[model samples]
Target: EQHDLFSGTFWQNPHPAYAALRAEDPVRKLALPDGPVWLLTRYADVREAFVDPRLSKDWRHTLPEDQRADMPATPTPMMILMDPPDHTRLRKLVGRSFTVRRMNELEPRITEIADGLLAGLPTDGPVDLMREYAFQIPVQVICELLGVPAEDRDDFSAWSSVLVDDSPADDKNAAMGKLHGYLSDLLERKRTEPDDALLSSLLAVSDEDGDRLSQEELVAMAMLLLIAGHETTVNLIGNGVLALLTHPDQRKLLAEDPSLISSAVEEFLRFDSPVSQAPIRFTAEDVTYSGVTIPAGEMVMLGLAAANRDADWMPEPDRLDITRDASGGVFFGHGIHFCLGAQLARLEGRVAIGRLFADRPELALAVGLDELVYRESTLVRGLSRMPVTMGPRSA
Candidate 1:
């Protein structure tokens, strides 16, 4: 019965079980398919684990030999899986491109992208927003930013979707190879004929002493940006829209004053966080949380969504209040590994959700809440498809 904690029901709606775990057994040991690992369900423990030096994200080097044999080889090294010194270096190299000014400058173009997608939504009957609108906006933005050709956008989208889903290892490896191959060639092309896009810019970026991202790092960085930029934002739009539709009062508040869209986005991240759990962290040394000591070389899973829902941290945690102080939540995780796309995601969410509600004030869900299907991913929480009926076309 304990395995039922990660059953279909838990995946469908995990907050209830998360609340129970946080209350009853914050730090519990459980056996996953691979091996036995510890799950931290409490807010404090999850938050603390993020910064604890003993908990290392660099699994390639840190995972025990017994656990490492079954793991699939990474097509390229991704910064998300690295610890401080490596993570710190990569973050600094890439952080310059993600300045607040850069994201702010992206708003007008993002709004234009949102408008173009919204205008094409069918008014005749039910339409799947996830397929048409939600996925379109961010895919285009990332593509444009990275200079990915229009012809290749569909392939890129498919590769990322496959990589994130709970697919077979063979299929996942195939997708990962294709994405890596594409970016490798793209990086080469950018070197010869540089453009104004981020990829070209990254090629030229270096430190005062002339340190720059190597070829392997560049390709890997491109892959990370594309997937992280597109996948998470897609869920932000889908999950945020679903939240507002289900709770009319919150929707009305946003509809009344569109300025609340920013805060509303935060509430959505907290309410049904796009990222369900932080990446698996290995205990570099004996790490104690709430008096439970996870020995060195043990696998630890930090509950990001569970922490966000902890009532001790947020009053009326279950309720979706746009006006509430939803700040300081771990929807994007905490400390150094916080999402690089957080600013961009917030902007896209605001523009997408704000524009849709404003354009179609009477928009409503086409099916019951239970009819919707969530994606089969432990790391990401998102709807596979969101069908809604447009009340009427705005003049």
Candidate 2:
């Protein structure tokens, strides 16, 4: 029996099945190869679940072994996996670095970094945007902001990549242990010799009675910022470039009206969100939605990418239209758990795409679109490599 609703290949491109789910049952349960999880497919339900107090982010507290199929819970203890009060406090400690005002101050510096990266690209022929441009820029920015020495970035990138990749064997865990050990040292340095960076700012923060963040909290915060901030933006830039190259007309349109770059970035995020799988959540208590009763402690996976393309939300959800009105899209997610770096990610996308198209109009994919390999993991969907033929420099 061929069912659109449940198949491995179908999960790869789940929009059609998602549309069916949205029309028939907005909230559906599924038994995946790894485990059993409820699927939330509609835009509204996805948004609601993100904010709903009933849904908790602390999987260890909310989910049982049967629900998780014995898989170890995510390792990082950053607020993304914790409940409120704690979530709010922890987020506030790091939120200052991501505020709009702080990011606006970073624009000139970020622009310099972007331009420097583009200048380093191959002048005459094919290059892997993922390697040369997309991967380099965010990592560079993050390294600079975190005061990491340039020589250490390669080591940092290697460890971070292995940490995020689905297959973390003994070697990868060893790399992670070393990386965290380095961060623990860095945290101590920040405490002693605080400078004018995000880490320093976090070091400066204290609770109501002048109590500073504990070593554990500080290390977790640094790890989260380094891994999540660095890895996710690389995908966004790579994915945005792929979308533009595949849709040349939209690319040209963006080049003409650079003002539309903001909206174009939104479309890119909606079309191929970097983080395809919603951060896992657990049912705090018995809850019923869309005629399905999800028992307490059940793991619920929100298909963010699927919800973005649901026909019920957008007229032609599959098409990548920069000019389309996508005001209500959940590209950055929603509610209390909305991404703190949403603005920064958008800025990076807009700057990366706008400058690439405007400055190098003739850039085209060296490999055919169909041949470009998608990433292996279901957690973060992005291109493995974006080979492109750079046009001659403008006179």
Candidate 3:
């Protein structure tokens, strides 16, 4: 009953396999070595299920007894898991900090960050864009935005590297716990001597607005925001660039019409969405799709990558077309748990890729596409190394 969907080879290029599943059983349960994962493969199913209140974001409410023992030692309260009053309250408060205006305000700063990194890229030599550029921009931006003191920023950068890293379990757990503690300490410091940072701004929220924001919750929010904010975009740029680099025809189209960069970014996200799967949502009660009833408390996975490639919604689901309206894909996710930094991420993707090609109109791959290695994490799909080069600077 075990499915190859859990295999490394499966994630490498998942759409073909997903197509097979969608043909026979769009919502069939995939029995894995560990447990059964209910998958929603159709675009309509994932789009609707994503917003269905029948699906509970917090699995802790009904986690099977067998899984309870595996919970992390320092499991922090994340708003992504909560529902209704709790989820609603947290998002309302936090949403105030992340405004369209906030991302707009950051445009100039983001351009500077991207330009600085691109400037140092080897003009006529091979360089790993993943290491040098894809990862650094968001990390630096979020650190400054959150008011993480310059000295303490390394802790975040270093901790982030290990947490996503496929290290030994104990080491990963210890690093996660340590980061939580570090943020907790930072929260205390911000309370007494507030700074003009996002955290301090959050601290200013009055209890009169029914400030449900507690110290523990704030620490948890900080950890989630920091990790999600940076990690998501790292793959966004890495995967997106790889797509452009390999698909030269599309790349040339984008290069010719710089204005298409915005649409190109959307295509990039849909083509190989970084967050391969969303955080698991559990069944609040019995749920049915296509007449099959799923019992309460089982883990349900929205086949985001699969749905993005569905032909019903997109003209050529697998092909990358910069001009295609890929608004059909929920790459940043949907419903209430939609990405808090969606606009910011879009801006970064737009600015970063737009600027990269603009800098080197002749940018290209330095190695065969077969030679590149993708990140092995179940949560993300990106290259570990993206070697690329550009033609000499204009005279």
Candidate 4:
């Protein structure tokens, strides 16, 4: 008999339940607040679901008419929210800056930012790694990378948290409103006084009406990048560190073989990937995987975390090996929607984790494994708070 997954410690750590799902039915409909979405668990099904061109990422039309309007896609669609030609156009424009190697230029800057944040960690007492270190490094980097102001950090953080959360409708809408509003304001500011940031670079100067990103599109792009760029890396660092600290063998392995940190970063991503699930996908046309048939208008979801851990895909998916070749298309999105920021995210993870541990050798978890609380959001999985100390606590 099958037991319900996502119960008890499942929210805090859903891996065990995900393992259960992979072995059992791979594609099953689960009721969500809005409605039921097909949760695909196995690697083959999940991998196919992502590349399945028949599944539409922008599922607004398939949703109820009322729900369609209320759906949280940017009022003006971003690359992730759009299909090919449009997706390709915007992605090409944005792709100019983030060549996989382009991230290397920011390495020194990222190291500097990481070290600065680490230096602030209290040596005398315990601290929340998520808030103090994990949160700041990426937020600061992306804001700086995109030319977003440091002043607006707290505001966007609050706004993004609510918008992505799988809670009630009213709350999500309200937060989305504020987030768009703020980005709109910043968009105008950038237009008027452009700077050397990516936002400014992305700012297209239309002749009051030119073939470039519109105000709404700009706002949407900023919102997507801010949330996607900022949030994913947060989990990468937080989850990656926890993976090492909990699996002391891996931690010690990295410490001994510092050259392996790059590969170690890959293992970090594969072990407990940052992006748990891809965005909401709907069957554009009736699509079938294996024997199961999904009709048009039905909701479909690609479980990145589940696929990453599928035993058939990777050798001993349950275990974390720094040397594991996790490059078989799991962590980053595949096809056109493949995470545009993948290179940057990987670079951020590599530099952040490497520099973080290199500086603080004696760091240890302050609480027991059972005490940690993961963020209670279905879209992405990460820690709400990771309490850690520099060494033994003061008596």
TM-score of each: 0.91, 0.88, 0.90, 0.87
lDDT of 4 by residue, 234-272 (tens): 999999999989988888889898889889988888889
For model 4, state the Cα shift of residue 106 in Å.
Answer: 2.7
lDDT of 3 by residue, 1-395 (tens): 23367575575677677777666788878766667878888888889998899898766646665767766422457788788877788888788877666678788888998999888877877888888899888887787777788898777788877876756777878987888888788888989999867788777765575665788878888878878888899888888888888898998898778899889989988988888778777897889986778888888888777788888888778888989886768888888989898888989899888888888877788988667787765557778888888766544
Worst 10 residues of 2 by lDDT: 1-10
Q: Where in model 4 is the C-alpha error above 4 Å?
A: 1-3, 60-74, 100-102, 150-182, 188-194, 204-210, 392-395
lDDT of 1 by residue, 1-395 (tens): 24246656776677888888888778887666667678898888888898898888756545666677776434357888887687888899988777676777778988898988878777756999888889788878887778888798878877776776546778877887898899889988899998767888888889898989999899889888877777788998999999999999999899788899889999999998888778788887888888878888878888888899888888899999999887789988889989988888888889998999988888899999888988766677889888899777666
Could you give candidate 2's per-residue lDDT for residues 1-395 as a string of tens digits? Answer: 33465455453455566667777777777766678888887777787788788888867645554566665434666778777787887787777556566677667777888888777777666888887888777766776667675678788777776765646477776876787798888777777898766777778787677766677787788777767777688888888888888897898788778899888888988888787768678898887766677888888878788788877778888899999886877867787778877877777778777777776778988987657776655557777788898786555
Give the RMSD in angstroms, all C-alphas superposed, for model 4: 3.9
> Roughly what TM-score does model 4 have, to 2 decimal places?
0.87
How much lDDT does candidate 2 score? 0.76
* Least well predicted 10-residue stretch by lDDT in candidate 3: 67-76
Q: What lDDT does the true structure give each of the candidates? A: 0.83, 0.76, 0.80, 0.78
Q: Of the candidates shown, which would achieve the greatest lDDT relative to the real structure?
A: 1
**Deviation (Å) of 14 in candidate 2:** 4.0
Steric clash pairs (candidate 1): none
